[PDB]
Write a protein that binds this ligand. Structure first.
Ligand code: CLA
Ligand code: CLA
Ligand code: CLA
Ligand code: CLA
Ligand code: CLA
Ligand code: CLA
Ligand code: CLA
Ligand SMILES: C/C(C=C=C1C(C)(C)C[C@H](O)C[C@@]1(C)O)=C/C=C/C(C)=C/C=C/C=C(C)/C=C/C=C(/C=C/[C@@]12O[C@]1(C)C[C@@H](O)CC2(C)C)CO
Ligand SMILES: CC(/C=C/C=C(C)/C=C/[C@@]12O[C@]1(C)C[C@@H](O)CC2(C)C)=C\C=C\C=C(C)\C=C\C=C(C)\C=C\[C@@]12O[C@]1(C)C[C@@H](O)CC2(C)C
Ligand SMILES: CC(/C=C/C=C(C)/C=C/[C@@]12O[C@]1(C)C[C@@H](O)CC2(C)C)=C\C=C\C=C(C)\C=C\C=C(C)\C=C\[C@@]12O[C@]1(C)C[C@@H](O)CC2(C)C
Ligand SMILES: CC(/C=C/C=C(C)/C=C/[C@@]12O[C@]1(C)C[C@@H](O)CC2(C)C)=C\C=C\C=C(C)\C=C\C=C(C)\C=C\[C@@]12O[C@]1(C)C[C@@H](O)CC2(C)C
Lengths: 85, 164, 166
C-alpha cells in the first residue's frame, strides 16, 4: 500500500495489480499504438468524413475511446520505466 | 461449501443451524445487513402464507364462484376490477385490523412470525423435530407458491389465460 | 526450461497443475492475470466450445421436432432468436454467469474453490484424486480441441454452404 510518494516517480502500486506487472517496454509501444489507432478512428468517424446517422461505426467509436485511454497507458509506461520495470 | 442450495459458495455468517428452511441461500449477502433474521423470516413467512392463499384462490376462482353475479368473473385480474369496491375494502379493512396488532408485535418479538394461530391445535403434542419438519414444509410450500403465484400473474398479464 | 516450448524459458507462474501444465505461455499471460482466473476462463471456453461443436454437428444432421427447427445451424441463430428459444437460453445463462461472478470472486479472495469447479458430479464419474486429475486433463484437452474445431466449423460453414465436411 502507501500510494503516497515524494521521490521522482510514484511506486508501481498506484497502477493497480494489473498494470503494476506490465513491463514498460510493453506499455510504451502499446500506448503509442493505442494513441495512433484512436486518433485515426476519430479522424475517420469525423473530420475526414462528416458524421451521419447511417455512419456511426462502433469500431471507430470504440476506437476513439483508445485516445483517452492511451493517455493512461503511457502515463503508466513512464511510471513503470522510472521504477525499474 | 456450506450452502446446500449453492454447494459451491460459502454461506453468510447469519445462515446457520436453527431457523428451519436454512439452506445457505443468500448469495447477495442480504443477511449481512439485517441485525437478525427475525424480521426477514417474518416477512418471508407472511409472503409464503399470502402466496399459498393466493394460489388456492386463483385455482378456486378459476373453477368455483359464489352464487352472486358480481363474483362471476373467471379471470382473477379481471375480477379485481369487476368485483365491487365494497367487497375489496372490507377485505382490506379485515387485513389491516389483523395487521396493526401484528405491526406492534413484529418489530420487537423474538418470533414475529408466531402469531399464535393454531385453532385446530395441530402443534399441541408435537415434538421439536416434528415441529421443525412442519416449519420446513410450510416454508417449502410457500416458496413454491410464491413462484407459482407470480407466474400466474405474469401469464395472465401477458397472454390472458389465467391457468395453463 | 519449458516443456511445451523448448526454446523459450518455462513460465514463472506455471510449475504444477493437474489442468495440463506443460508450460505453454510464450506471451507470459500468467504474469498479467492470476493463474486461477485464466484457468476458470479456459475451462469455461472449453465447456462452451464442446457443447457448441456437438450441437452444431447434431443440429445439422437430426434436428427438426417442429417447423421452425428446419434450419442448417448457420441461419439457425437469427431464426431461433426470432422464435424466442435463444432468449430463454440467454436468460438462464445470464443467471448462471451472475452466480459465477460470486464463485470467481469467492476464489481469488480465499475459500478453496478450484478453477472451473462447480461440484457438479451427479453421476460420480470421478471417484478419487487420480481419476479427477486424469479427467481434468482429458476435459481440458477435449475442450481445446473443441475450441479449434468449432472455429474451423464456423469459418468453413461461412466460407461456403455445405454439410458435415464443411
Ligand atoms: C495533470 C493531470 C493528472 C496527473 C498527472 C495524474 C496522475 C495520476 N493519477 Mg489522476 N486524475 C486527474 C488528473 C491527473 N492525475 C483528474 C483530472 C482526475 C479526475 C478527477 C483523475 C482521477 C484519477 C483516479 C480516479 C485515479 C488517478 C490516479 C493517478 C495516478 C496513476 C494514474 C495512472 O496511471 O492511471 C492509469 C489509468 C488507466 C490506464 C485507465 C484509463 C483512465 C482513463 C483516463 C479514463 C477515461 C474515462 C474518463 C471519464 C475520461 C497518478 C499519480 C490513480 C491513483 O492515484 O490511484 C490511487 C487513480 O486511481 N487519477
Ligand atoms: C418476499 C420474498 C422473500 C423473502 C423476504 C425471503 C427471505 C429470506 N429467505 Mg427466501 N426465498 C424466496 C422468497 C423470499 N425469501 C423464494 C421465492 C424462494 C424460492 C426460490 C426462496 C428460497 C430460499 C432459500 C432456499 C433460503 C431462503 C432464505 C431466506 C432468509 C435469508 C435470506 C435473506 O435475508 O434474504 C432476504 C430476501 C429479500 C429481502 C428479498 C429481496 C428481493 C430480491 C431482490 C428478489 C428480486 C426478484 C427475484 C430476483 C426474481 C423474482 C421474480 C420471479 C422470477 C419470482 C430470509 C428470511 C435462507 C434461509 O432459510 O435463511 C434463514 C435459505 O436458505 N430463501
Ligand atoms: C390472498 C387471498 C385471497 C384474496 C385476496 C381473495 C380475493 C377475492 N376472492 Mg377469493 N379465495 C381465496 C383467497 C383469496 N381471495 C381462497 C384461498 C379461496 C378458496 C376457498 C377463495 C375462493 C373464492 C371464491 C369461490 C370466490 C372468491 C372471490 C374473490 C373476490 C371477491 C371477494 C369474495 O367473495 O371472496 C370470497 C372468499 C371466499 C369464498 C373464501 C376466502 C377464504 C379466506 C382467504 C380464508 C380466511 C377467511 C376477491 C377478488 C369471488 C369472486 O369474485 O370470484 C372471482 C368468488 O366467487 N374467492
Ligand atoms: C391497513 C392495512 C395494512 C397494514 C397497516 C399493514 C401493515 C404491515 N404489513 Mg401488510 N398487507 C396488507 C395490509 C396492511 N398491512 C394487505 C392487504 C396485504 C396483502 C395480503 C399485505 C401483505 C403484506 C406482506 C406480504 C408483508 C406485509 C408487511 C407489513 C408490515 C410492514 C409494512 C410496511 O413496510 O409498511 C409500508 C407502509 C405503507 C404506508 C404501505 C403503503 C403501500 C401502498 C398503499 C400500496 C398500495 C406491517 C405490519 C410485511 C411484514 O410484516 O414483514 C415482517 C410483509 O412482508 N404486508
Ligand atoms: C412455478 C413454476 C412454473 C410453471 C410450472 C409454469 C408453467 C407455465 N408457464 Mg410460467 N412463469 C413462472 C413459473 C412457472 N410457469 C414464473 C415464475 C414466471 C415469471 C413471473 C412465469 C411467467 C410466464 C409467462 C410470461 C408465460 C408463462 C407460460 C407458462 C405455460 C407455458 C406453463 C403452464 C406462458 C403461457 O402459456 O401463458 C399462459 C406465458 O406466456 N409463464
Ligand atoms: C453451446 C450450446 C448450444 C447452443 C447455444 C445451442 C443453440 C441452439 N440449438 Mg442446440 N444442441 C446443443 C448445444 C447447443 N445448442 C447440443 C449439445 C445438442 C445435442 C443434444 C443440441 C441439439 C440440438 C437440436 C436437436 C436442435 C438444436 C437447436 C438449436 C437452436 C434452437 C434452440 C432449440 O430449440 O434447441 C435447443 C439454437 C441455435 C434446434 C435447431 O433449430 O437446430 C436446427 C434443434 O432442433 N440443438
Ligand atoms: C470430454 C468431456 C468431459 C470430461 C471428461 C469432463 C470431466 C470433468 N468435468 Mg466436465 N463438462 C464438460 C465435458 C467434460 N468434463 C462439458 C461439455 C460441460 C458443459 C456442460 C461440462 C461441465 C462441467 C461442470 C459444470 C462441472 C464439470 C466437472 C467435471 C469433473 C468432474 C465431473 C466428471 O467426472 O465428469 C465426467 C464427464 C464425462 C465422463 C463425460 C461423459 C459425457 C458423455 C456425453 C471432471 C474433471 C465438475 C468439476 O469442475 O469438478 C472438478 C463440475 O462441477 N464439468
Ligand atoms: C418445447 C421445446 C421446443 C418446441 C416445440 C415442441 C412442442 C417440442 C414441438 C413443436 O412441434 C415445436 C415447438 C417449437 O413448439 C423445447 C426446447 C428445447 C430445450 C428446452 C432445450 C434447451 C437447450 C439448452 C441449451 C442449448 C443450453 C446451452 C448451454 C450453455 C451453457 C453455458 C455455460 O457457460 C455457462 C453459462 C457456464 C459455463 O461455466 C459453462 C456452460 C455450462 C457451458 C450455453 O452456452
Ligand atoms: C416470488 C416472490 C419473491 C421472490 C424473491 C426471491 C426469489 C429472492 C431471492 C433472493 O433474496 C434471496 C432469497 C437471497 C438473496 O441473497 C438472493 C436473492 C435471489 C435475491 C414473492 C412472491 C409473492 C407473491 C405474493 C405476495 C402473492 C400474493 C397474492 C395476492 C396479493 C392475491 C391476489 C388475488 O387477490 C387478487 C389480487 C385477485 C384475485 O382474483 C386473485 C387473487 C390471487 C386471490
Ligand atoms: C394452500 C396451502 C396451505 C394451506 C394451509 C392452511 C390454510 C392451513 C391452516 C391451518 O394450519 C394452520 C395455519 C393452523 C391450524 O391450527 C389450523 C389450520 C386452518 C388447519 C398450501 C399451498 C401450496 C401451494 C403450492 C405449493 C402451489 C404450487 C403451485 C404450482 C407449482 C403451480 C404451477 C402452475 O401455476 C403455474 C405456475 C402456471 C400454470 O399455468 C400451470 C401450473 C402448473 C398450474
Ligand atoms: C460435448 C462433449 C462432452 C459433453 C459431456 C457432458 C455434457 C457431460 C456432463 C456430465 O459429466 C458431467 C459434466 C458430470 C456427470 O456426473 C454428469 C454428466 C451430465 C453426464 C464433448 C464434445 C467434444 C467435441 C469435440 C472433441 C469436437 C471435435 C471436432 C473435431 C475433432 C473436428 C472436426 C472437423 O475435422 C472435421 C471432422 C471436419 C471438418 O470439416 C470440420 C472440423 C470441425 C474441423
Amino acid at each position: 500500500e502507501s500510494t503516497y510518494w515524494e521521490g521522482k516517480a510514484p511506486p508501481s502500486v498506484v497502477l493497480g495489480p494489473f498494470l503494476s506487472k506490465i513491463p514498460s517496454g510493453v506499455l510504451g509501444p502499446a500506448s503509442l499504438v493505442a494513441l495512433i489507432v484512436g486518433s485515426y478512428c476519430t479522424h475517420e468517424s469525423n473530420i475526414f468524413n462528416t458524421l451521419t446517422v447511417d455512419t456511426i461505426y462502433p469500431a471507430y467509436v470504440l476506437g476513439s475511446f483508445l485516445t483517452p485511454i492511451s493517455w493512461g497507458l503511457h502515463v503508466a509506461a513512464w511510471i513503470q520505466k522510472m521504477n525499474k520495470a | 461449501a456450506q450452502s446446500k442450495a449453492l454447494p459451491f459458495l460459502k454461506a453468510p455468517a447469519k445462515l446457520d443451524g436453527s431457523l428451519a428452511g436454512d439452506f445457505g441461500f443468500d448469495p447477495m449477502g442480504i443477511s449481512d445487513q439485517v441485525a437478525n433474521l427475525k424480521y426477514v423470516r417474518a416477512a418471508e413467512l407472511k409472503h409464503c402464507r399470502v402466496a399459498m392463499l393466493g394460489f388456492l384462490g386463483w385455482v378456486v376462482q378459476q373453477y368455483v364462484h359464489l352464487p352472486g353475479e358480481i363474483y362471476a368473473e373467471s379471470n382473477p385480474l379481471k375480477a379485481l376490477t369487476s368485483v365491487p369496491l365494497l367487497s375489496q375494502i372490507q377485505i382490506f379493512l379485515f387485513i389491516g385490523a389483523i395487521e396493526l396488532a401484528t405491526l406492534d408485535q413484529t418489530y420487537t418479538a423474538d418470533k414475529p412470525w408466531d402469531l399464535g394461530f393454531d385453532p385446530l391445535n395441530f402443534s399441541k403434542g408435537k415434538s421439536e423435530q416434528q415441529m421443525k419438519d412442519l416449519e420446513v414444509k410450510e416454508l417449502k410450500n410457500g416458496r413454491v407458491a410464491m413462484i407459482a403465484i407470480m407466474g400466474l400473474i405474469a401469464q395472465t398479464l401477458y397472454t390472458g389465460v389465467p391457468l395453463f | 526450461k519449458s516443456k511445451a516450448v523448448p526454446f523459450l524459458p518455462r513460465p514463472a507462474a506455471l510449475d504444477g497443475s493437474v489442468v495440463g501444465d506443460v508450460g505453454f505461455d510464450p506471451v507470459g499471460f500468467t504474469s498479467w492475470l492470476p493463474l486461477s482466473y485464466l484457468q476458470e476462463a479456459e475451462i469455461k471456453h472449453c465447456r462452451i466450445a464442446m457443447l457448441a461443436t456437438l450441437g452444431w454437428i447434431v443440429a445439422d444432421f437430426v434436428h427438426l421436432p417442429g417447423a421452425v427447427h428446419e434450419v442448417s445451424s448457420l441461419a439457425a441463430h437469427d431464426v431461433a432468436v426470432k422464435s424466442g428459444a435463444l432468449a430463454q437460453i440467454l436468460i438462464w445463462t445470464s443467471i448462471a454467469e451472475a452466480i459465477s461472478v460470486i464463485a470467481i470472486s469467492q476464489m481469488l479472495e480465499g475459500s478453496g474453490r478450484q478453477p472451473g469447479d462447480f461440484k457438479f458430479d451427479p453421476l460420480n464419474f470421478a471417484k478419487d484424486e487420480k481419476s479427477l486429475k486424469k479427467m481434468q486433463l482429458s476435459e481440458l484437452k477435449n475442450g481445446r480441441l473443441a475450441m479449434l474445431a468449432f472455429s474451423g466449423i464456423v469459418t468453413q460453414a461461412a466460407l461456403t454452404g455445405h454439410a458435415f465436411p464443411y
